[PDB]
Symmetry: D3
Subunit: 160 residues, 6 copies
Amino acid sequence: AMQFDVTIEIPKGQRNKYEVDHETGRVRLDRYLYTPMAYPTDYGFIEDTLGDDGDPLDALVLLPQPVFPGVLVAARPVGMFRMVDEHGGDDKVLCVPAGDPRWDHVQDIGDVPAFELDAIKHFFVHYKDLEPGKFVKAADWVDRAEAEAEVQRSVERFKA
Amino acid sequence: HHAMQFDVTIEIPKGQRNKYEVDHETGRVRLDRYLYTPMAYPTDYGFIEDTLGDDGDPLDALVLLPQPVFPGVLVAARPVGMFRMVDEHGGDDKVLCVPAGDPRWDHVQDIGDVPAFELDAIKHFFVHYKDLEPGKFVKAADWVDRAEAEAEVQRSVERFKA
Amino acid sequence: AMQFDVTIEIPKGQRNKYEVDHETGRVRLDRYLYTPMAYPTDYGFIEDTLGDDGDPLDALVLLPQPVFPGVLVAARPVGMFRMVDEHGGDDKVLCVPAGDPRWDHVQDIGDVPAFELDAIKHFFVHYKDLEPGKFVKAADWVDRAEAEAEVQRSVERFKA
Amino acid sequence: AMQFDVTIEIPKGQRNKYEVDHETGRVRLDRYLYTPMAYPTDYGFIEDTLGDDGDPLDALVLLPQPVFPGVLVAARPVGMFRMVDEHGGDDKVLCVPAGDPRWDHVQDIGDVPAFELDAIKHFFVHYKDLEPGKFVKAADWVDRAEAEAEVQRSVERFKA
Amino acid sequence: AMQFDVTIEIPKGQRNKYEVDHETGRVRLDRYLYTPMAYPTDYGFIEDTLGDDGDPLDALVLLPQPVFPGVLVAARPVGMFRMVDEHGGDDKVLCVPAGDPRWDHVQDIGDVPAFELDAIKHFFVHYKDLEPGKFVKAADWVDRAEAEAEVQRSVERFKA
Amino acid sequence: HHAMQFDVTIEIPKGQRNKYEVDHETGRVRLDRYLYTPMAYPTDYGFIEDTLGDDGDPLDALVLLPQPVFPGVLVAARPVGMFRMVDEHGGDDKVLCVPAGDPRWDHVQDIGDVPAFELDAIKHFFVHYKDLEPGKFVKAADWVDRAEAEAEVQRSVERFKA
Ligand SMILES: [Ca+2]
Ligand SMILES: [Ca+2]
Ligand SMILES: [Ca+2]
Ligand SMILES: [Ca+2]
Ligand SMILES: [Ca+2]
Ligand SMILES: [Ca+2]
């Protein structure tokens, strides 16, 4: 069972796109979204990883109640939203709290209702509709094994 | 020189994904549904009292506010434009309003006085909020001026009185 | 498939105990709770019913997001919480939103996770612990059929 | 011990000035305040009273947690903020929840800390600073006996 | 008159149990509570202390309005909550804001109303009821001097 | 043609009566006090990073936003005016800002582009928020333009670098 720490940048329900500057650990308001949309899950990145975009690997965490920007959550992957946009790959690892028995029933991507996966997909397709040049070329959900292999690659990229 | 005004009942505060709706015989607030998309109402949303629109409900309204109100609250309002759209149940236009008698909104007199970014975000909401509801759609949506808005309010009042 | 309107008096997360005056339809603050507890679900009653206690039949509604006091929700029962306290028998019907396919997987009491049922039970067992004269003798979950039986009894008593 | 129902129009912390239209019982947004101020207590009026201004007698209720606009609270008077503004008298009866033992220590105006009375006075002196023509000619706190005599007068004005 | 800085981890009203990682200063979500309960006061720890349990000495701070996780508050002790659970002795120091004249009337444990002390006690007695393996053996309020004695012990252990 | 910008750390979100403040050696957020008046910060409030004002702290800033942020959050910002005031610890000016690089604020270039109602409410806050604190005051407060704002930012940066 793979587990890691996720730093949550943006709580579920937010239109303010907070980001962590990785050099300093400070929270910054990147922008107020130009679309009438809100993050469908708590959103952030996986500590000690490094991705295609220059940043740590993005992460989505399912929670019963959202946290605050900058909060750490020990998490375990259950799938991943593979997306290629105009800038290349920017995949989003879907996770649940690690070590919490209320989430033991969610082990892989099939265990997450289709309604919630569809709404997450909808967010990332459309949230930058009113920012020119942005679009999604592909967007598919893939399973836990895919997520884990992708995490483990991003961890090696970070180390070396 | 003497500006039109009316009362708007706000059903849904800005930032809501719960789609509340007033029942028009009883005056009770009902939860229609939780939205299926990760979207939220871009303004306070409701209807004009004592009007009747071509979907059998009172005419839809959007009110620009400095801070949202609660479901069921009345706001005296004046029209500045309208969002024309057509969904599955046909035409369903939305009158854009500001608070009446409030000098902080006097710079807004017609649809061109509303920043385009806000007009586009409102439009984006209605175009997409039912994207994940089977058999639902919204097509042909665009913005028209205070004149067209007022003339349509006028009709809906006429429908109501009948 | 039985369904009815529930008026929600108290949103999930509240320590203010709101009640609807049935003579008038106005929302009243009965009291601020004496214990550091909060309603674990949206809470209220079923319209046009009369419980064995003389008020409309109490209802709990599972929701993805809470509503406001006074709000109507079309609901369908999936179980019932049976309790005996100082004033005797008291039942609370557990419901989900009617006509919403996101809740079609919840058909009976066994479909609600145990953690959630235990938390609801724990609320009603303990929330009046610091009000003198109160107690709870027993508290048990029963299934949809027993829930539907009590809804019918309470409908028939309203008409009476 | 005098007690009455107060309809709360404006929860503590609000800059939106809600009002009840007394002919219909509907909640209306009268205005967003022009000053950077917020109601220091839950604020409303006493049901079945009638005052100098044409409206029911205004009321302030001390609470551990604010309510929602339109909510009823059974209350008992502990004092009153006598104020004369440009429109004449518009006194505000200060109250606590009736029948709640957590408020038994507050029986008259001396029992309310000076810091809270000063902040309430400050609100009503300044909240209309940025609306022309408004000002306060006098503003003093008076005791429970004064409040009660003033309530009982406003109740007779209503009845007859 | 003893005073110290308290880092608030958890605002009043929270069911999310946030903790500060003492190695790093980052805020972490330890867990969502298993009971329908919420922290009755802002909750955290005293800076540069070490409790008998190995973490900084826990602190509760009475406030007119909650703060955010990670926020420092200059505080002075007025009492202490002594508890024994499954892992043994655990003390929580009850405090008010230091240098604030609105709290000068609270000097010792007898100055905090009984309803509030009982609610705080009830939280710590019951909040872990649905976590298996937990229990509470005893829970008692002691006065300011015993609080100040434990603050000193814990300061001396930090320096050690 | 090339506009000045800087980073503002927001200590207090709009609508707050809790007066939070960042410690300038550690970067920790502290609660200074709960305000004594029934007032709340009319905008998000904070300071400009890497500056030093004439009260020994970094230069105070106000940032106009569509939605508030949390205590400690950074916002890249550009100045549009300044609120000059003098309290008990003497001069303590406040630079008025909007988000930098955001076309929704491009119509705001100088202090005259900010509606007067918002400028007056900001002023009212600072004039009165310490009315009930013994021995505190705020006098001589008024609004000046982007030029005076930028030149003062410039100084405070110069002070800082020293
Ligand atoms: Ca990314
Ligand atoms: Ca319509
Ligand atoms: Ca009942
Ligand atoms: Ca009045
Ligand atoms: Ca501890
Ligand atoms: Ca300063």
